Each structure stands twice: as C-alpha cells, then as structure tokens.
Amino acid sequence: KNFSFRIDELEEMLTNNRIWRNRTVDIGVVTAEDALNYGFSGVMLRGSGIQWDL
Amino acid sequence: ASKVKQDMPPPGGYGPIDYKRNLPRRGLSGYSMFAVGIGTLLFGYWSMMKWNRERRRLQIEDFEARIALMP
C-alpha cells in the first residue's frame, strides 16, 4: 500500500527528464514483423504494438 | 476441539491499494514565468543604471581632484 509512491518518485526522476528521453527515445527501434520473426517475447513484443500476453 | 487456524485475510478484506500514476502539476503558466524573468531583468537594469551613473559622477570627482593636484 506504499509502493505506488515509490514508483511515482521513480517516474518523477526519470519519466519526464529531457536527458533520459534523449537517451532512450528512438533508440533500438524494432518493427512488429521483425520482432515476431526474430523470436522476441514479452515487453520486447508489446513495445512495438503487438497485443500478446501469456 | 480446536478449529482451523491459518494465515487468512481479515473479514471484510483489506483496504484499497493505490496504484495509479500520480505526478501532480505544481502550477505556473509559461506566460507567468516569462513575465517574472522580464520583470527581474528590468529591475536589475534600472538599479544598475542608477548605480553606474553615480559611479560616473564619483569618477569625475576623483579626476577633478587629480587635475587640481597636477601642477
């Protein structure tokens, strides 16, 4: 019942920071078809828009 | 005799658990921030204008003293 505030502090430190965004935005872009063919799963699939969860 | 006793939730369950993202918006418009910056810049400009004019007058006074002493 107190972990959500810890996640909120994490997001405050990282989510909207411009340095973090410039480090992570548009980096390692993989298409859905390439993700499926290469054998990716989990977040590696769901980040490209594929709706799959075991 | 004794009844079953093991780790169970209390009757009525537990209280609600917050999980939604909560990043509040502190509050000040971009217009307000720009206006504050411009206002402090103008105040500093005016203060420095007055002080620099006074410094010019003081320098002229010192120069007059030196000129009087030169001969």
A33: CB partners within 8 A, 6+ apart: none
Q: Tell me, yes or no, if A15 comes closer than 8 A to chain B by beta carbon.
A: yes
Instruction: Decide: B18 and A4 in contact? Cβ < 8 Å.
Output: yes
Which of chain A's residues have a Cβ under 8 Å away from the Cβ of B23?
8, 11-12, 15-16
Instruction: Decide: B22 and A8 in contact? Cβ < 8 Å.
Output: yes
**Which two three-digit tokens encode residue A11?**
């997001």
Q: Tell me, yes or no, if A29 comes closer than 8 A to chain B by beta carbon.
A: no
According to DSSP, residue A16 is labeled T
Alpha helices in B1-71, H assignment, sequence order: 30-69
Instruction: Decide: A47 and A31 in contact? Cβ < 8 Å.
Output: no
- Tally Cβ neighbours within 10 Å of residue A32: 13
Length of chain B: 71
Single-letter residue type at A17: N
Interface of B with A (CB under 8 A): 15, 17-23
Nearest to B16 by CA among A6, A4, A9: A4
| Cα B45 to Cα A46: distance, rounded to the nearest angstrom | 55
Instruction: Decide: A12 and B23 in contact? Cβ < 8 Å.
Output: yes
| Cα B64 to Cα B67: distance, rounded to the nearest angstrom | 5
Q: Give the C-alpha distances (Å, rounded to integers) separating A44 from A3, A11, A39, B17.
A: 25, 21, 10, 29
Q: Give the C-alpha distances (Å, rounded to integers) separating B31 from A33, B40, B46, B62.
A: 46, 14, 22, 46
**Which two three-digit tokens encode residue B17?**
């658990």
Resolution (A): 2.7
Nearest to A1 among B17, B20, B23 (CB): B17
